[PDB]
Amino acid sequence: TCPFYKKIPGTGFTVDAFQYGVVEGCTAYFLTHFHSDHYAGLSKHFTFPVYCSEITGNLLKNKLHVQEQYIHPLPLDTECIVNGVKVVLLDANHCPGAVMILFYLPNGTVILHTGDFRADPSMERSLLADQKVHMLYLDTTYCSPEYTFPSQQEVIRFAINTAFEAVTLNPHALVVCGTYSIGKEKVFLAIADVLGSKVGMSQEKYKTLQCLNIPEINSLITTDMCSSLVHLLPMMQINFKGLQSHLKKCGGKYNQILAFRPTGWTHSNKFTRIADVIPQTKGNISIYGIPYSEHSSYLEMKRFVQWLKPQKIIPTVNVGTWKSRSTMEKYFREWKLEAGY
Ligand SMILES: CN1CCN(C(=O)Nc2ccc(F)cc2)CC1
Ligand code: NI
Q1: How far is CA 264 from the centre of its chain?
Q2: Angle formed by the axes of helices 152-169 and 185-195, to 10°?
Q3: Whose CA is nearest to atom 2 of ligand 1?
């Protein structure tokens, strides 16, 4: 059964609610982004209206084979009427196609649902600048002050400089990057660009990337592994055993692997600056864990909420324990008292 924080009151709408069968009273199902915890349940057999971005719609059609007649893509930054209710989709600064949704309820209430997001000051000059938001359904993934990490730009600078140094010292080194979902494409694209290579990958991953509206993508990716010195593999294979096995398959073209695992936050963020990060090494294989986040840091989240000044906050992540719920509620009260709303 569908939980309360996935229902939008007085609209007939649910958000990211495809794993509960037919939800009583739901006339339209919104999907914020194409990550499996959120799309869980969609297939070629779904026959209710789905509202989403153009990119999410491309993935629904081609990867999950949802029929075209049920996919309703909406442009960003544009007032749209859906089943008698005004809505707006805004970029969430998460993975490709990820949106936040603004709902203008018939009674005058205004709700913002962030989906998954990485809060940024640029959001303070979207269509949010205008009007009051009464209720905020908030991505609280990293809602605790211990969660610090660098900007995406600083992490990409580190990865580019590391890869370029290694391959210039050894032109027979292979670079490998882990993936298990869409998002974080800049990691492998930036490294391939500095090295003058296309990114090599499976047919299945190539298909997924072709759905994303990335400019000049045919120039950047390929299924021909032999032509490429940046390879993508499943995240599960980014370990000494799996990389040893991959190196065997490359027919003596390479004699070294440099690999990257883009994680979220890890406990080594409490001790180590991005500049100081070192790999794990065994023989001719080195593995770097890099803290590339597509979710708000604690400080980014706090700044956005203190700017927005919502009347009520409904968390959508870490909702399953009393300890987590009490911790989040204490932070929301601190933020409100400090800022005066
Ligand atoms: C006192 N009620 C609370 C629930 N409520 C509502 O509208 N629920 C809902 C159901 C299904 C859906 F899709 C969306 C919302 C508002 C009035
Ligand atoms: Ni996500």
Answers
A1: 10
A2: 40
A3: 9
